[PDB]
Amino acid sequence: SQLNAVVDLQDRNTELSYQLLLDSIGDRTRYFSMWNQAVDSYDPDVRIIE
Amino acid sequence: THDVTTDRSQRLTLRFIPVDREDTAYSYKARFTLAVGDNRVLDMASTYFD
Amino acid sequence: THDVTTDRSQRLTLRFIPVDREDTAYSYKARFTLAVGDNRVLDMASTYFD
Structure with a gap:
């Protein structure tokens, strides 16, 4: 076909979309080495001093 | 208005x-x-080695 | 006179x-x-690395 099935826009945000998709379908708290699936977090005690 | 250019x-x-590629002595x-x-034609005159 | 060699x-x-190519340590x-x-056959015995 030589026709490209892929058609992207500078306007789209694939990376983020995937971030949000993951959260909706599972527990982002779990780690998965294969995809470097280890969410960015911070210590609650550091962000908010108690 | 029709049958000339693609949409x-x-x-x-x-x-x-x-x-x-093969970089040789001379x-x-x-x-x-x-x-x-497919659905394309190429005029060799329009080619060149950059 | 026929069916042996090409014209x-x-x-x-x-x-x-x-x-x-990959030039490594050892x-x-x-x-x-x-x-x-197409229309060819190759006898591996006739190959070699120069």
Whole structure:
């Protein structure tokens, strides 16, 4: 076909979309080495001093 | 207004990378895969080695 | 006088340049694209690395 099935826009945000998709379908708290699936977090005690 | 130009997505200019290269003592060999997609025609006069 | 040899233009010997090379610590890797054209047969015994 030589026709490209892929058609992207500078306007789209694939990376983020995937971030949000993951959260909706599972527990982002779990780690998965294969995809470097280890969410960015911070210590609650550091962000908010108690 | 019709039957001249495409309405479809399509590049005017394509660039090809060498598939095989051979830098020798007194010469240089470059091999490409010149691909002419379906629904397209190419006028050789419009080609050149960059 | 017939059905043995070609009348057509054709090289007896072909030479192939490596497509990928990898000079390492204790070894060397060479990759080629051995191409057997249509209406041709190749006896491996007749190949060698120069």
